[PDB]
Design a protein around this nucleic acid. Structure first.
Lengths: 262, 180, 124
RNA sequence: UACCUGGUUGAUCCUGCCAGUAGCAUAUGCUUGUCUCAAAGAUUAAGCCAUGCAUGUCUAAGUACGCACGGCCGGUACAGUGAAACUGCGAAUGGCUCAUUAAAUCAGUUAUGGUUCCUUUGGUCGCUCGCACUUGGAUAACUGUGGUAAUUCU
RNA sequence: UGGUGACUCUAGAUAACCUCGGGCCGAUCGCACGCCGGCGGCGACGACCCAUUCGAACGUCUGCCCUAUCAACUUUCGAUGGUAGUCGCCGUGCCUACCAUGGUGACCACGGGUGACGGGGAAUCAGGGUUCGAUUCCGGAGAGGGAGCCUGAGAAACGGCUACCACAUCCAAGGAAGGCAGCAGGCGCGCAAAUUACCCACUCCCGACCCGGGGAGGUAGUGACGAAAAAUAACAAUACAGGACUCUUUCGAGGCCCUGUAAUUGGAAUGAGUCCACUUUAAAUCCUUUAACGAGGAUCCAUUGGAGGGCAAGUCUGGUGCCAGCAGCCGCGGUAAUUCCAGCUCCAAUAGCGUAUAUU
RNA sequence: CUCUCGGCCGAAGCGUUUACUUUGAAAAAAUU
């Protein structure tokens, strides 16, 4: 390598894109953007695989360049734009808004939201600096640099922000008894109430989180996204409530579904 | 770099002793009973049975309340029941070891044509299977190794396009009927 | 008479302004049906004219029963000219492909690369 | 399927190897009707290469005075499409081979509080107390004269 | 002010500096046009910096194959450390100057070799293990050998440049031009490996970009590398041959007995092929689907190895006669050859099967 | 196993240090 790589092979592509094995050698290289190449969803994969609107890459070209797709209320024409977590996608022609939220199994679900819900989003604050004549700045997980926040906002908190105005509206503090979602590791997509945060100066803060069914698990601190103040979440949720069904009881549900409709 | 897959398996294992009388004896007996082309078919069924038994051996050694043992074993027992080998009474992973090769050879579509009376010889069953005369539900199957399931066992028919079925007698009847 | 058209998964793309569907064809006696014939079948089925609709990718099933293809139904003809792949337009005579070979167009490109100025237009 | 069989002696019981047995991979022989996948100048020589191709690029949105065109309506600064050329970006991705290389490469793990970063995305873009109702000079494209046996030379 | 586990952090105050090879503070384009002579909405390009994304770059701990006929290695020409600097994007003997004499080693240092690019992984395998990994994914390295650069955010780049070396092309003999370990193709080397095809329709990438380009890639061609399925015949009646059962002292006779063998008879059913039409597709080809012709075995005919033991299947017939030869090993051949060579019969695997080598 | 700071508990030391075991989170896809 003499410079930045620009191609991505299909088998090296993030597994959660559920790409095939046999259509091609390459995968969409997500452009550089507000989200990591692994923790994201290129617009083409969301449009021609999840929704089946387009059938080729060229039909995604024909859709995105007509200016129907909007990510966070701004028209985005890039076909491989990195759309990520807590992300609002709006299509005005069909009049439908989805949110990208992690699935129970760790993938991205297509979660259809109310157009009332599409006006706001949640951003986990990532760092807080004070620059240029005492002006405070937040950097969130979408790289949204926000000047002049609430002084109570500290790192690892969440801020609910408005998409149109770009300003923060209200913040959820990182505290035990707050409903969080996991954004990485084996526990990805599981949603539960924070019980304990343990400190390791030097290394990574491991956090113990109790699920809705009483199945406690743990994560590193960076993989935690806070949503609910208390037990009530600040957003709508997928068809599963974020609880990880184990294999045998999932098969039980499958067999019950076959018995229900025949 | 290509958009292809090279994953492939060999579905038989040749025996280690090449010419021992009892092995050749048993294989030739099964060839006779179930009407097969060569010894590779018997080796194929024996290798599939060895696969199932090896899975059961790996599953017995685990503890009874192991979630992996439970899930894998119950799925395997469901699979062998749906083929038509095990019985609903003996759905235990212990009984999987008590399986024999002919319990899999009885489920071939060749033998299911033979037993159910669709044909009259097992070579006759094979020659009807190859020539597109036997269908399952609504699909004409041409393969004499189709392992027929229990729910699929009930209705095997004449493949209505066949002369034995709906109509259209073949080339021989058509030619002999236009002799004069 | 013995042919029947059924439609599996069906979807209205407002943002591609068409209707896509999966087409099942039943023809227990005949051959694989022509794409033209199924075009008038869908035209009478969806109450539109046959001049705007497109079908492709029909794989007849082993034996000779079902045939499954993909078919998409455009709103007006101009939208069909705008959005369809041009090889599916050239099956209806709506589009004509350039008749030069790649190897010829590339030798010509390197030839006119070797020249500078308006004399790039003269070479052929 | 946690396997063995022949061979030293007059015969036995051994040590013991040789040979058989099965695989898997390259070559090769002989033969080859159907059908679905599918490896393929690695080994020997990281030896040498005739020829063709493999890296280009324009939107309403940098520069149009090529009649090059159908074409405005005519003193209408510039209607449109637009070859060429300047400008900007790419050409550092991809492909290929395994010669080097033995704590090197590489793998898991940590670190940059020791640094660089096109692009993308969000911020910043009258904080500065000091001709603008529009600044200057070239140079291609084109015209015209040429050199050299010869070049993507000029 | 705010923050880390920890700042010589971020922020603030003051004194100053701010390179002529200089740092930012729009002399830019498009779209609709509109309100009290002046004010304006949307978009594109741009920009010092910050944060981000894509990374790159250095460090950390642990983990390599064979070799002692490699036991001491390093340090004059930096080897190990200290202080100050130089260069560097930075941390450092990275380099320089001055000091100190250190650093590694039987827990195998140093030197060699390697038919060594590493890993994910492959084959085998009860358990343990053994062997392999050039090879489509990841990381590395190099474009004939070395070296040095330009431009750029990113290169010590080679489908860029400049040199020397080694080859090598066109000459008008003055000069000019190279780089297939890219795709096809050739020579050469070999035991050993395909088309100088077609297309950007798929997958994705590049650009000023709903448009252009792509030997990346796709698609056909060669392809018994290897892998999956799977034809080369099925039924009935006769005609013999046996086997049991019954009746018969036996010989023999029957069966709504069995089992074989029939260039025997009868019909039906089919696919390999030739060919239309459709479908497939970028256009094709193939597979799949339809009409038409298409099968009696004396062919639309199955091979490759074998018949002494190991090791399945002949002490069958003729030829050669310790010759020719066979035979992995043990051995045979010297005249009834159970082993050679044929025929017949038979065995093993079966569209496959022999041999050689490597490895398990 | 405990003495201080805060709301019966949370902070702070733990305990001579390790080997061992068990759990937890991190550990590329393909292959298995």
């Amino acid at each position: 390598a003499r410079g930045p790589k620009k191609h991505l092979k299909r088998v090296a592509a993030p597994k959660h894109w559920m790409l095939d094995k046999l259509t091609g050698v390459f995968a969409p290289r997500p452009s550089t953007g507000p989200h990591k190449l692994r923790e994201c969803l290129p617009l083409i994969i969301f449009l021609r695989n999840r929704l089946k609107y387009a059938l080729t890459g060229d039909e995604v070209k024909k859709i995105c360049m007509q200016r129907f797709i909007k990510i966070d209320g701004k028209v985005r024409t890039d076909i491989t734009y990195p759309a990520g977590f807590m992300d609002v996608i709006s299509i005005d022609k069909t009049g439908e808004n989805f949110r990208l939220i992690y699935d129970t199994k760790g993938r991205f679900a297509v979660h259809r939201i109310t157009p009332e819900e599409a006006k706001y989003k949640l951003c986990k604050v990532r760092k807080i600096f004070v620059g240029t004549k005492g002006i405070p700045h937040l950097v969130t997980h979408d790289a949204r640099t926000i000047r002049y926040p609430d002084p109570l906002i500290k790192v690892n908190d969440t801020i609910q922000i408005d998409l149109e105005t770009g300003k923060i509206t209200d913040f959820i503090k990182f505290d035990t008894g707050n409903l969080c979602m996991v954004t990485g590791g084996a526990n990805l997509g599981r949603i539960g109430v924070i019980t304990n945060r343990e400190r390791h100066p030097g290394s990574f803060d491991v956090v113990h989180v109790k699920d809705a069914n009483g199945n406690s698990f743990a994560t590193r601190l960076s993989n935690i996204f806070v949503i609910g103040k208390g037990n009530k979440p600040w957003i709508s949720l997928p068809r599963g409530k974020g609880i990880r069904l184990t294999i045998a009881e999932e098969r039980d549900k499958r067999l019950a579904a076959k018995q229900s409709s025949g | 770099p290509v958009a292809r897959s090279w994953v492939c398996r060999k579905t038989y294992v040749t025996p280690r002793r090449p010419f021992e009388k009892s092995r050749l004896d048993q294989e030739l007996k099964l060839i006779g009973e179930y009407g097969l082309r060569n010894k590779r078919e018997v080796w194929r069924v024996k290798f599939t049975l060895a696969k199932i038994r090896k899975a059961a051996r790996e599953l017995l050694t685990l503890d009874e309340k192991d979630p992996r043992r439970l899930f894998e074993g119950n799925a395997l027992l469901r699979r062998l029941v749906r083929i038509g080998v095990l019985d609903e009474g003996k759905m235990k992973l212990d009984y999987i070891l008590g399986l024999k090769i002919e319990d899999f050879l009885e489920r071939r579509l060749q033998t299911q044509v033979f037993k159910l009376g669709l044909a009259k010889s097992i070579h006759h069953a094979r020659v009807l299977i190859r020539q597109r005369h036997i269908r399952v539900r609504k699909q004409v199957v041409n393969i004499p190794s189709f392992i027929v399931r229990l729910d699929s066992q009930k209705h095997i028919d004449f493949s209505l396009r066949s002369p034995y079925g709906g109509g259209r007698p073949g080339r021989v009847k058509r030619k002999n009927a236009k002799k004069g | 008479d013995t042919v029947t058209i059924r439609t599996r998964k069906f979807m209205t793309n407002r943002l591609l302004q068409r209707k896509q569907m999966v087409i099942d064809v039943l023809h227990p006696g005949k051959a694989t049906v022509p794409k033209t014939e199924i075009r008038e079948k869908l035209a009478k089925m969806y109450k539109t004219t046959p001049d705007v609709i497109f079908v492709f990718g029909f794989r007849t099933h082993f034996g000779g029963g079902k045939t499954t293809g993909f078919g998409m139904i455009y709103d007006s003809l101009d939208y069909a000219k705008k959005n369809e792949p041009k090889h599916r337009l050239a099956r209806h005579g709506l589009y004509e492909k350039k008749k030069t070979s790649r190897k010829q167009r590339k030798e010509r490109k390197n030839r006119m690369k070797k020249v500078r100025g308006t004399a790039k237009a003269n070479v052929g």
